[PDB]
């Protein structure tokens, strides 16, 4: 396996004090439990129950995430990432961190954002709406990459949209990591439909560009109205359905370039496939969302070679966003 480096923000953490990325030695400063009053449940998560609440101290609208017991190392990482990124554009802000003195169980308190069900939301988005919100997610990603942090779970579930106020937040940093040039990460880190080829072929020296693939998947679902775009049945099958769109030739070039040991179990399932034109996924029900610049932007995000992909700031430059600059 040939080593790899991020083309941007390569050395952010290299020139940052230990205290910035050494989340393990980070000490949490707790708030008061009794400062918060629960109002409504917002639904079950896999690792937390989420409640609508109010800070009775200053009457601020809050959301509290009551955590299920999980390894504390993981939550310390999330907290330190949240703290390092606070104030950033379209980054959810951690307001406070509290603990229940009777049950010991911790809970994270975030700013309230009024979220619309994304399933019904993408169904009504205008051409401008896709560009605008895409430009907003980009803001959060460039910011967080510039702070030496990969999100690693970019997907519609983790994007809070308040449509009436056209306000967007990137949430759920529980999988996020600090980028260190040369470091090998574990690849079991995204949601299936949003995993980058680098994860699926078990290439460990990845970077911020992973998020840009995921953001690519989101764009493909929005402009084509096919959510999710790559609907694989498992990790192996996920690559196959990517290969069915991007082609097997560029996939094999990708492994060769990085001297990747492709899992022997891929031998009978990949086959041969050609690069499809993006205009093939265009029909009369989604046509109004698709423009030449949209298809160019997408093609420059969905590529096997993670180094080839547009960086977040390079993506903000694209023709596709020329109207959303006002």
Whether residue 169 is found in the same domain as residue 266: yes
Whether residue 293 is found in the same domain as residue 232: yes
Helices (H) and strands (E) in the chain, counts: 10, 9
Whether residue 183 is found in the same domain as residue 273: yes
For the question of residue 253 being annotated catalytic, the response is no
Q: Look up the domain containing 189 and give its range.
A: 4-21+113-326
Distance of CA 188 to the CA centre of its chain: 14
Whether residue 225 is found in the same domain as residue 131: yes
N- to C-terminal Cα distance for the chain? 45
Query: Positive or negative, the Cα torsion across 141, 145, 147, 153?
Result: positive
The CATH number for 49's domain is: 3.30.200.20
Strands of the sheet with 106-111, listed across from one edge = 36-44, 48-55, 60-67, 106-111, 94-99
Counting the structural domains of the chain, the total is: 2
Whether residue 94 is found in the same domain as residue 222: no
54 close to 36: Cβ distance less than 8 angstroms: yes
Exposure on the CB side of residue 27, measured as CA atoms within 13 A: 1
d(CA 133, CA 159): 10
Question: Among the options 129, 142, 153, 172, which is catalytic?
Answer: 153
Among 74, 89, 112, the domain boundary falls at 112
Whether residue 324 is found in the same domain as residue 194: yes
Among 112, 127, 155, the domain boundary falls at 112
Entry resolution (Å): 2.4
The CATH number for 12's domain is: 1.10.510.10
Contacts of 59 (CB under 8 A, 6+ apart): none
The answer to whether 251 is annotated as binding is no
d(CA 314, CA 87): 22
The answer to whether 44 is annotated as binding is yes
The two three-digit tokens of residue 197, written as one number:
């080829």
Whether residue 197 is found in the same domain as residue 288: yes
How was this entry determined? X-ray
82 close to 173: Cβ distance less than 8 angstroms: yes
Whether residue 141 is found in the same domain as residue 107: no
Give alpha helix (H) positions in 28-117. 72-85
d(CA 227, CA 179): 30
Among 112, 141, 169, the domain boundary falls at 112
The answer to whether 46 is annotated as binding is yes
The answer to whether 271 is annotated as binding is no
């Amino acid at each position: 396996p040939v080593p790899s480096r991020a083309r941007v923000y390569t050395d952010v953490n290299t020139h940052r004090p230990r205290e910035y990325w050494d989340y393990e030695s980070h000490v949490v400063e707790w708030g008061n439990q009794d400062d918060y009053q629960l109002v409504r449940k917002l639904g079950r998560g896999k690792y937390s129950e989420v409640f609508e609440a109010v800070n009775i101290t200053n009457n601020e609208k809050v959301v509290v995430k009551i955590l299920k017991p999980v390894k504390k190392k993981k939550i310390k990482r999330e907290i330190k990432i949240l703290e390092n990124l606070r104030g950033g554009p379209n980054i959810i802000t951690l307001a406070d961190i509290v603990k229940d003195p009777v049950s010991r169980t911790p809970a994270l308190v975030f700013e309230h954002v009024n979220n619309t069900d994304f399933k019904q939301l993408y169904q009504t988005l205008t051409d401008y709406d896709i560009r605008f919100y895409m430009y907003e997610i980009l803001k959060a990603l460039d910011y967080c990459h510039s702070m030496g942090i990969m999100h690693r779970d970019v997907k519609p579930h983790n994007v809070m949209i308040d449509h009436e106020h056209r306000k967007l937040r990137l949430i759920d940093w529980g999988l996020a990591e600090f980028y260190h040039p040369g470091q090998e990460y574990n690849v079991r880190v995204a949601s299936r439909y949003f995993k980058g080829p680098e994860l699926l072929v078990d290439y460990q020296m990845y970077d911020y560009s992973l998020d840009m693939w995921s953001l690519g998947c989101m764009l493909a679902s929005m402009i084509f109205r096919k959510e999710p775009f790559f609907h694989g049945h498992d990790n192996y099958d996920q690559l196959v359905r990517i290969a069915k769109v991007l082609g097997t030739e560029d996939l094999y070039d990708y492994i060769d370039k990085y001297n990747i040991e492709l899992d022997p179990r891929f031998n009978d399932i990949l086959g041969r496939h050609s690069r499809k034109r993006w205009e093939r996924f265009v029909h009369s029900e989604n046509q109004h969302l698709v423009s030449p610049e949209a298809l160019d932007f997408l093609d420059k995000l969905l590529r096997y070679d993670h180094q080839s992909r547009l960086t977040a700031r390079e993506a903000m430059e694209h023709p596709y966003f020329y109207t959303v600059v006002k």
